[PDB]
Structure formats: structure tokens, C-alpha cells
Amino acid sequence: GRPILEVPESVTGPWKGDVNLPCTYDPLQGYTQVLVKWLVQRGSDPVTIFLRDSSGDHIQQAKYQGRLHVSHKVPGDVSLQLSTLEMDDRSHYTCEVTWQTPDGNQVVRDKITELRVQK
């Protein structure tokens, strides 16, 4: 009855290749997606690397500009697409989605995945 994010616990991608960090949900009648964020935690707290809002897509660090995109064509698929994987891309990533609900309130869900980089 309420949106459920589907995010694998871990993903392995090839060093200097590409990989997707899946994040999907089945769209529910009467829910409106209003925000998507991807975060990474290389240090002590998660930091935002990507935001999609009413003005579109915003990449928050230069090292991702040209390497990071987020799925958009299929409703409910907000997977993160990373190209030229670096060893330093190994980390825990968080997918966070915000919806407006039929009653007018907003609800937020998130889920964490680990990216492993394989030589």
C-alpha cells in the first residue's frame, strides 16, 4: 500500500568500466515522486552526490560530472549509472526518494547499497 524501494545490498562493478546501482519501486496510484537523492559515505556521514528535483538533475561534485547519470525513462527506476569506476568509488551509497501522498503529506524512503570494484 505504500511505496517500497528495491535496492540490492551490494553491487560489484569492473575497475575502469561501468555499473548500475539499482534503485527501483513500483509506482503507486496517487503518489507523486518529488525528490530523488543519491548519497555516498566515504567518511563519517553521507553526502549528496546527485539530486533530481523540479529543476532537473544536479551533480554535486566535479569528479562525477561526465561520469554519473541516473535512470529516468521508466517510472520508478532511479538507478545510479557510474562510468569509469575508480578504486575510490568503493563505498556505501544511499538511494533516497520522496513522494507526495494521496492525503497531501510527504513520505521519504531510503536504502543503502555497497559498491565493490573488481579488478
Side-chain angles (χ1 to χ4, degrees):
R2 101 290 176 101
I4 296 168
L5 295 179
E6 309 157 309
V7 174
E9 187 269 343
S10 78
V11 181
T12 300
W15 181 47
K16 300 180 290 176
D18 305 341
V19 85
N20 273 25
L21 305 188
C23 184
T24 66
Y25 62 92
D26 199 0
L28 298 181
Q29 284 185 31
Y31 285 77
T32 301
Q33 183 188 106
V34 300
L35 191 59
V36 180
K37 291 174 63 165
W38 279 92
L39 304 96
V40 73
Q41 187 184 142
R42 294 282 296 169
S44 303
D45 290 81
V47 302
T48 302
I49 68 178
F50 170 93
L51 178 79
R52 175 175 293 151
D53 65 10
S54 60
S55 63
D57 288 4
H58 313 278
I59 292 175
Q60 303 293 302
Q61 314 183 359
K63 70 183 206 185
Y64 299 119
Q65 277 266 56
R67 298 215 283 139
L68 185 162
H69 310 260
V70 169
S71 296
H72 54 91
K73 292 189 97 300
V74 174
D77 185 349
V78 293
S79 302
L80 180 76
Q81 307 150 139
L82 207 46
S83 61
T84 313
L85 294 182
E86 298 288 330
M87 293 307 189
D88 289 346
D89 289 325
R90 179 201 171 83
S91 195
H92 288 94
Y93 294 74
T94 304
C95 181
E96 184 195 275
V97 182
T98 303
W99 300 266
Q100 279 258 291
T101 76
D103 296 328
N105 58 126
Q106 288 190 177
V107 297
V108 182
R109 297 289 182 271
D110 68 27
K111 279 201 168 62
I112 299 169
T113 192
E114 176 183 18
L115 175 57
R116 303 165 86 79
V117 181
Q118 185 175 46
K119 286 202 299 166

